[PDB]
Amino acid sequence: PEHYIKHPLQNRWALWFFKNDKSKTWQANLRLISKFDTVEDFWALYNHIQLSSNLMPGCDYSLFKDGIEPMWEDEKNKRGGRWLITLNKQQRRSDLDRFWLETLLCLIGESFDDYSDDVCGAVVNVRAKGDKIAIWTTECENREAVTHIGRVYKERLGLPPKIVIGYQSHADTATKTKNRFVV
Protein backbone atom coordinates (compact mmCIF):
# COMPACT_ATOMS: atom_id res chain seq x y z
CA PRO A 1 0.00 0.00 0.00
CA GLU A 2 1.20 3.52 -0.99
CA HIS A 3 1.66 6.08 1.81
CA TYR A 4 1.26 9.54 0.12
CA ILE A 5 -2.57 9.31 0.48
CA LYS A 6 -4.28 10.53 3.67
CA HIS A 7 -6.46 8.01 5.52
CA PRO A 8 -10.06 9.11 4.92
CA LEU A 9 -12.75 8.91 7.56
CA GLN A 10 -16.19 7.48 6.85
CA ASN A 11 -17.63 10.83 8.01
CA ARG A 12 -16.57 14.47 8.06
CA TRP A 13 -16.63 15.71 11.66
CA ALA A 14 -16.95 19.16 13.19
CA LEU A 15 -15.32 20.17 16.47
CA TRP A 16 -17.12 22.77 18.55
CA PHE A 17 -16.10 24.78 21.62
CA PHE A 18 -18.40 26.27 24.23
CA LYS A 19 -17.60 28.83 26.93
CA ASN A 20 -20.26 30.92 28.68
CA ASP A 21 -18.53 34.26 27.99
CA LYS A 22 -20.27 35.77 24.93
CA SER A 23 -24.07 35.64 25.42
CA LYS A 24 -26.82 35.12 27.97
CA THR A 25 -28.43 32.80 25.37
CA TRP A 26 -26.82 29.34 25.46
CA GLN A 27 -26.53 28.74 21.69
CA ALA A 28 -24.63 32.01 20.96
CA ASN A 29 -21.69 30.75 23.07
CA LEU A 30 -20.96 27.90 20.61
CA ARG A 31 -17.91 28.29 18.34
CA LEU A 32 -17.12 26.02 15.40
CA ILE A 33 -13.39 25.32 15.75
CA SER A 34 -12.72 23.17 12.66
CA LYS A 35 -13.82 20.32 10.40
CA PHE A 36 -11.81 17.27 9.27
CA ASP A 37 -12.34 14.07 7.31
CA THR A 38 -9.05 12.19 7.53
CA VAL A 39 -7.10 10.60 10.38
CA GLU A 40 -4.08 12.89 9.76
CA ASP A 41 -6.22 16.01 9.93
CA PHE A 42 -7.89 14.79 13.13
CA TRP A 43 -4.48 14.49 14.79
CA ALA A 44 -3.29 17.91 13.50
CA LEU A 45 -6.35 19.43 15.17
CA TYR A 46 -6.16 17.36 18.34
CA ASN A 47 -2.47 18.26 18.72
CA HIS A 48 -3.21 22.01 18.36
CA ILE A 49 -5.91 22.30 21.08
CA GLN A 50 -6.02 22.21 24.86
CA LEU A 51 -6.57 19.00 26.78
CA SER A 52 -10.05 18.98 28.32
CA SER A 53 -8.43 18.88 31.77
CA ASN A 54 -6.73 22.27 31.02
CA LEU A 55 -9.98 24.07 30.10
CA MET A 56 -11.66 26.49 32.48
CA PRO A 57 -14.66 25.07 34.33
CA GLY A 58 -17.81 25.76 32.31
CA CYS A 59 -16.28 24.91 28.91
CA ASP A 60 -17.30 22.12 26.49
CA TYR A 61 -15.90 20.38 23.49
CA SER A 62 -18.35 18.68 21.11
CA LEU A 63 -17.46 16.47 18.13
CA PHE A 64 -20.43 15.98 15.80
CA LYS A 65 -20.95 14.62 12.30
CA ASP A 66 -20.87 17.55 9.90
CA GLY A 67 -24.47 18.63 9.40
CA ILE A 68 -25.56 17.88 12.97
CA GLU A 69 -25.45 20.89 15.31
CA PRO A 70 -24.32 19.96 18.85
CA MET A 71 -27.69 20.75 20.42
CA TRP A 72 -30.96 19.03 21.36
CA GLU A 73 -32.89 21.00 18.75
CA ASP A 74 -31.14 19.48 15.72
CA GLU A 75 -33.40 17.21 13.66
CA LYS A 76 -30.98 14.33 14.35
CA ASN A 77 -30.84 14.92 18.15
CA LYS A 78 -34.41 15.89 19.15
CA ARG A 79 -35.70 12.28 19.31
CA GLY A 80 -32.32 11.09 20.57
CA GLY A 81 -30.37 10.87 23.78
CA ARG A 82 -26.98 10.23 25.35
CA TRP A 83 -24.91 7.61 27.12
CA LEU A 84 -23.49 9.57 30.07
CA ILE A 85 -20.13 9.10 31.83
CA THR A 86 -20.08 11.07 35.11
CA LEU A 87 -16.65 11.73 36.60
CA ASN A 88 -15.80 12.70 40.15
CA LYS A 89 -13.53 15.73 40.78
CA GLN A 90 -10.37 13.61 41.12
CA GLN A 91 -11.06 11.92 37.74
CA ARG A 92 -10.36 15.24 35.98
CA ARG A 93 -6.71 14.27 36.51
CA SER A 94 -6.87 10.48 36.20
CA ASP A 95 -9.47 9.75 33.52
CA LEU A 96 -10.94 12.82 31.75
CA ASP A 97 -8.40 13.22 28.95
CA ARG A 98 -7.92 9.50 28.27
CA PHE A 99 -11.72 8.88 28.26
CA TRP A 100 -12.31 11.87 25.94
CA LEU A 101 -9.60 10.75 23.51
CA GLU A 102 -10.99 7.20 23.50
CA THR A 103 -14.43 8.69 22.79
CA LEU A 104 -13.03 10.67 19.82
CA LEU A 105 -11.37 7.53 18.48
CA CYS A 106 -14.60 5.53 18.86
CA LEU A 107 -16.43 8.11 16.82
CA ILE A 108 -13.97 8.77 13.93
CA GLY A 109 -13.12 5.06 13.61
CA GLU A 110 -16.82 4.01 13.19
CA SER A 111 -16.50 1.65 16.12
CA PHE A 112 -20.22 0.76 16.52
CA ASP A 113 -20.46 -1.67 13.55
CA ASP A 114 -24.10 -1.99 12.27
CA TYR A 115 -25.20 0.94 14.50
CA SER A 116 -22.55 3.57 13.67
CA ASP A 117 -25.18 5.60 11.77
CA ASP A 118 -27.16 6.10 15.01
CA VAL A 119 -24.17 7.97 16.51
CA CYS A 120 -24.50 11.78 16.24
CA GLY A 121 -21.54 12.99 18.23
CA ALA A 122 -19.98 13.35 21.65
CA VAL A 123 -19.72 16.07 24.28
CA VAL A 124 -17.30 16.70 27.14
CA ASN A 125 -18.40 19.15 29.84
CA VAL A 126 -15.64 20.47 32.12
CA ARG A 127 -17.47 21.39 35.33
CA ALA A 128 -16.48 22.27 38.88
CA LYS A 129 -19.09 19.81 40.31
CA GLY A 130 -17.78 16.90 38.18
CA ASP A 131 -16.93 16.49 34.51
CA LYS A 132 -19.18 14.63 32.06
CA ILE A 133 -18.57 12.84 28.76
CA ALA A 134 -21.41 11.61 26.58
CA ILE A 135 -22.10 9.94 23.26
CA TRP A 136 -25.26 11.29 21.63
CA THR A 137 -27.38 9.02 19.43
CA THR A 138 -30.25 9.86 17.12
CA GLU A 139 -33.25 7.78 18.40
CA CYS A 140 -33.85 7.06 22.11
CA GLU A 141 -36.51 4.40 21.30
CA ASN A 142 -34.20 2.08 19.29
CA ARG A 143 -33.42 -0.24 22.19
CA GLU A 144 -31.20 -2.55 20.10
CA ALA A 145 -29.02 0.22 18.60
CA VAL A 146 -28.80 2.23 21.83
CA THR A 147 -27.88 -0.75 24.00
CA HIS A 148 -25.28 -1.94 21.45
CA ILE A 149 -23.64 1.49 21.32
CA GLY A 150 -23.51 1.64 25.14
CA ARG A 151 -21.89 -1.77 25.38
CA VAL A 152 -19.24 -0.87 22.78
CA TYR A 153 -18.50 2.37 24.60
CA LYS A 154 -18.19 0.74 28.01
CA GLU A 155 -15.85 -1.87 26.55
CA ARG A 156 -13.71 0.79 24.78
CA LEU A 157 -13.41 2.85 27.98
CA GLY A 158 -12.41 -0.33 29.85
CA LEU A 159 -15.13 0.10 32.51
CA PRO A 160 -15.65 -3.07 34.60
CA PRO A 161 -19.05 -4.87 34.73
CA LYS A 162 -19.95 -3.41 38.16
CA ILE A 163 -19.72 0.21 36.84
CA VAL A 164 -23.17 0.84 35.34
CA ILE A 165 -23.73 3.68 32.87
CA GLY A 166 -27.06 5.19 31.89
CA TYR A 167 -28.75 6.51 28.76
CA GLN A 168 -31.10 9.52 28.97
CA SER A 169 -33.34 10.94 26.26
CA HIS A 170 -32.69 14.59 25.44
CA ALA A 171 -36.46 15.24 25.79
CA ASP A 172 -36.19 14.03 29.41
CA THR A 173 -32.90 15.89 30.04
CA ALA A 174 -34.45 19.16 28.74
CA THR A 175 -37.57 18.90 30.96
CA LYS A 176 -37.60 20.05 34.60
CA THR A 177 -33.55 12.72 34.93
CA LYS A 178 -34.37 9.02 34.52
CA ASN A 179 -32.33 6.44 32.59
CA ARG A 180 -34.12 4.78 29.64
CA PHE A 181 -31.41 2.12 29.52
CA VAL A 182 -28.41 0.99 31.50
CA VAL A 183 -25.40 -1.21 30.63
Place this chain on the structure above:
Amino acid sequence: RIIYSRLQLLLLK
Protein backbone atom coordinates in the same frame (compact mmCIF):
# COMPACT_ATOMS: atom_id res chain seq x y z
CA ARG B 1 -17.70 1.41 5.52
CA ILE B 2 -14.33 2.84 6.51
CA ILE B 3 -13.42 1.52 9.96
CA TYR B 4 -10.24 2.07 11.98
CA SER B 5 -9.23 0.14 15.06
CA ARG B 6 -7.82 2.00 18.03
CA LEU B 7 -4.22 0.77 17.10
CA GLN B 8 -4.57 2.06 13.54
CA LEU B 9 -5.63 5.52 14.71
CA LEU B 10 -2.81 5.84 17.23
CA LEU B 11 -0.07 4.63 14.73
CA LEU B 12 -1.15 7.45 12.44
CA LYS B 13 -0.51 10.13 15.03
